[PDB]
Amino acid sequence: NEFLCDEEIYKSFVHLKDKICEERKKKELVSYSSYIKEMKKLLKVVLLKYKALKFGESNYFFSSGVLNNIVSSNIICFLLSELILKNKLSFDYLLGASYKGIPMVSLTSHFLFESKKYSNIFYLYDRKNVIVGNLDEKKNIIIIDDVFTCGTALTEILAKLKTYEHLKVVAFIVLLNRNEYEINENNQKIYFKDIFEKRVGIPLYSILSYKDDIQSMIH
Amino acid sequence: NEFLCDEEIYKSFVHLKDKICEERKKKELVSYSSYIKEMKKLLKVVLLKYKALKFGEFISNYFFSSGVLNNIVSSNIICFLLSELILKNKLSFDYLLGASYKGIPMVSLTSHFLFESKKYSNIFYLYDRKNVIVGNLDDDEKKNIIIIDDVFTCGTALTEILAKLKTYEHLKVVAFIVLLNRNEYEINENNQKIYFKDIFEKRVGIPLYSILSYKDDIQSMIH
């Protein structure tokens, strides 16, 4: 048994969470970034421990089902909440993409609520009546999901939401962006994230990325 | 408008959550019960404020919908109390399973309140789709599951989850916990009410617990 035990993970989560909040309040950006990076290290340990990441022939596989435990989801949902606060994203609703986003959205709401900036936080989810929650000049939605490859899943949710005239999506937040790309006529990588952001006019944020976080696990 | 504002609801939730935990730790049962009953009052105010309860005539004299409870001020109270049912009744479990869809955002947050008890090194939660059970499974001794859902009428929805779980040989359900039991019944040959809860418990051999019940909590709202 080769990884930090859950009791140690939690202790480290608590310490890092306190420092990250403290530094955000003090507006010390360099320290904030650094403590975020430490939390991301802890999260990568978790991903390996619970085997959310597996290696060997893509050269890695990612599954979020093994992250449905509170010690793991605390880290994840805390960091989703931090992306919202750090980037000062304004919203009326958070929407958890079915199914993986759904247990994330309540718990992320819980971490946001600790900022004391909100009198409540209203969250939604989509089935497969297709949008459920406290509904009915445009209301703004941030969508949460686990993984971004080409944007196929987020595009389907956008289709469901096009029906609802008074709703607008203003951001996507995700645990992992795979940094997928296509090569163009000049032998340059054109990333799906950039193509997707351009097509739908909405920014995507991610806790982790293949390039910054996963590739250094490969060897 | 006519109801406590969300800031006040939260302040009251915090106060009552602290007293409830304190009294459970001290094993003062009468005080614990009493503070639970205060939280239930607050929850009833929430159900009326967000119109999770509506009155008149439906297909019964009240209608219940949990979609308006998907906000943290309301789900705090609900999920806290689901956690307290687990603790108070000393229910042992390896997993919590949130019934799709309503139970799913409840299960993580209920896991969060359980985790505050410091009895657990982690809490592992599941959910079903409609491959069919998602979470930290190795499994196809038995692992124990408590199922969480919003409303119990005859048990049709819980029965469907049991069917999905029958495939998994190493899993066993040891309790159902629910926000509301409607206390539905049939009348028998002696003009006695036989409750679906009792019939359901007997058929599947698994206890059901509920935060609220029609008889104890909702009837007095009617007039």
Residue numbers in the entry:
A (entry chain B): 7 to 36, 59 to 85, 94 to 164, 173 to 180, 200 to 282
B (entry chain A): 7 to 36, 59 to 87, 94 to 164, 173 to 182, 200 to 282
Sentences reproduced from the published study:
Specifically, P. falciparum orotate phosphoribosyltransferase (PfOPRTase), the fifth enzyme in the indispensible de novo pyrimidine-synthesis pathway of the parasite, is of special interest. OPRTase catalyses the conversion of orotate and 5-phospho-d-ribosyl 1-pyrophosphate (PRPP) into orotidine 5′-monophosphate (OMP). OPRTase is a dimeric enzyme with two active-site pockets, one on each protomer. Once the substrate has docked, two different loops, one from each protomer, cover the bound substrate to shield it from solvent.
In our crystal, PfOPRTase 1–218(Δ37–58)-H6 packs as a set of four catalytic dimers, leading to eight molecules in the asymmetric unit. In the present crystal, the individual PfOPRTase molecules possess the conserved α/β topology also seen in other OPRTases. The PfOPRTase structure conforms with the conserved PRTase fold, having a 321456 arrangement of β-sheets. There are 2–6 sulfate ions originating from the crystallization conditions associated with each polypeptide in the core dimer. The two most interesting sulfate ions occupy the positions where the phosphate and pyrophosphate groups of the PRPP substrate are expected to bind. Remarkably, of the 11 active-site residues at the core of the human enzyme, five are different in the malarial enzyme. In this larger tetrameric structure, a protomer from one catalytic dimer forms an inhibitory interaction with the active site of another protomer but from a different neighboring catalytic dimer. A β-hairpin formed by β8 and β9 (243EYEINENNQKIY254) inserts itself exactly at the substrate-binding pocket of the recipient active site. This completely occludes the closure of the hood domain and would prevent crucial substrate interactions, including π-stacking with Phe97, in the hood domain. Presumably, these intersubunit interactions blocking the active site of PfOPRTase occurred at high crystallization concentrations, but they hint at protein–protein interactions leading to autologous catalytic inhibition of PfOPRTase that may regulate flux through this enzyme.
